[PDB]
Structure 1
């Protein structure tokens, strides 16, 4: 019928144009993210950009703290970002409540994936236009990255990037794990993994950075933290002295 794509219904090609369109709204902030696995840590960086000075820079964020061990990095519009953040925090509380231990990242990936599926099966839900990266350090699975997308599909990774120009970053990561011959960087301090990540980002995007142009989130064991600008500056200085 004339409606195949104002509601979630297959096309004559056997398809969902609507969900496609969701994927075509993940590149509007044009933020890029890069996430790699250390040996005992997980590191993720994202861009920060403010179009005006009259914003306060602190509040502009894309790294959202969901659990105490799971960080969430969002690619796509910020309204949907906030709705997703709220969803996830609810589910985390509820897992702790019903099973007696904090939510694993894997379980959260899948819970959020199934909610996604439900938004693309009900004829009056609009799907989220956000790709979520879940970074964690598990004690049963180790440092892990799970990526879910508006489809409700998710997959694991050794490393991954997101954004409009994230192919460049894919090249970088590919060559890096080509030389290393192993699925994670062998580094025993989270600092140097931040450093490596920023190096690959400068190479990939072709542009140098500053403390106010970055945003860094680190998942160590049994915690998650974000660095402030002051600590990011120090990483940048130690890059030049490699």
Structure 2
């Protein structure tokens, strides 16, 4: 054997074990989710409070690309940052040449091709993050989830991290119970609940909730963080549902 010792090597199955090993690093990370709604998307993430010494609200994990795209990820946090930095360069060159802000599907492939490129050579390591991202463009709302292999799809709801199965099960219920659609303000509240429910798989340390959102009506198509009253309202909603 030894097929797993080098990246970009096919096993006799037809698998790249190094990418599957990177997935294990993603599975190890904290829970992050994405919820598509009527006229936008909502992102949320679990921030494990390792210590009392962590400053609240000042270790921001959700990142913005351009002015209309939000990105969140689980796994090796630095790898995620590297991917977003690239995303920002890709979005900047698109706007520079084509004037219009980069569409979400276009942006999705830019990250997709870049992550896929890191499975082509043994001189690079695959990304140790699954990245949930999306936003609002001319064609409306889009939510995506990108994996270490470079594989991505459009989603109604997306989840990754240690509590992905708990979050997925909860996401599947929303899709079934709301066929006509979920509103932006609703999706924010649901996102809080799902992070709290997904926290049961990581319940040693208590956590800090962080939510962001793009919405054509609520945020005017721009990415904004959910803060203050709207955040506390979503936290209270989630606290009420676990009990």
TM-score (norm 2): 0.85
Is the Cα contact below 8 Å between 1:63 and 1:72 reproduced in 2? yes
Structure 1 position 56, deviation (Å): 2.7
Residue in 2 that maps onto 1:159: 157
The unaligned stretches of length 5 or more in structure 1 are none
Equivalent position to 2:213, from 218, 223, 227: 218
Residue in 2 that maps onto 1:17: 17
Is the Cα contact below 8 Å between 1:191 and 1:235 reproduced in 2? no
Is the Cα contact below 8 Å between 1:169 and 1:205 reproduced in 2? no
Instruction: State the SS of the aligned residue for 2:12.
Output: coil
Is the Cα contact below 8 Å between 1:42 and 1:219 reproduced in 2? yes
Looking at structure 1, the residues matched to 186 and 178 of structure 2 have their Cα atoms a distance apart, in angstroms, of 16
Residue in 1 that maps onto 2:172: 174
Looking at structure 2, the residues matched to 90 and 145 of structure 1 have their Cα atoms a distance apart, in angstroms, of 20
**Distance change (3 Å), C-alpha of 1:14 and 1:34:** closer
Residue in 2 that maps onto 1:47: 46
Residue in 1 that maps onto 2:33: 34
**Distance change (3 Å), C-alpha of 1:5 and 1:86:** same
Give CA deviations for 1:160-208 in whole Å, capped at 9, x if unaligned: 11112211122122223223334x32x3xx323211332344345459x
**Distance change (3 Å), C-alpha of 1:93 and 1:57:** same
Residue in 1 that maps onto 2:193: 199
**Distance change (3 Å), C-alpha of 1:12 and 1:203:** closer
Is the Cα contact below 8 Å between 2:44 and 2:210 reproduced in 1? yes
Q: What is the aligned-residue RMSD (CA, Å)?
A: 2.5
Give CA deviations for 1:24-49 in whole Å, capped at 9, x if unaligned: 111333x1122212212211211122
1:74 and 2:59 are equivalent in the alignment = no
Structure 1 position 236, deviation (Å): 3.0
Aligned 1:13-162 pairs, distance under 5 A: 13-29=13-29, 31-140=30-139, 142-162=140-160
Higher strand proportion: 2
Structure 1 position 73, deviation (Å): 0.5
Is the Cα contact below 8 Å between 1:46 and 1:215 reproduced in 2? yes
The unaligned stretches of length 5 or more in structure 2 are none
Is the Cα contact below 8 Å between 2:28 and 2:161 reproduced in 1? no
Looking at structure 2, the residues matched to 138 and 84 of structure 1 have their Cα atoms a distance apart, in angstroms, of 21
Looking at structure 1, the residues matched to 51 and 239 of structure 2 have their Cα atoms a distance apart, in angstroms, of 29
**Distance change (3 Å), C-alpha of 1:96 and 1:174:** same
**Distance change (3 Å), C-alpha of 1:204 and 1:27:** closer
Is the Cα contact below 8 Å between 2:70 and 2:133 reproduced in 1? yes
Is the Cα contact below 8 Å between 1:148 and 1:155 reproduced in 2? yes
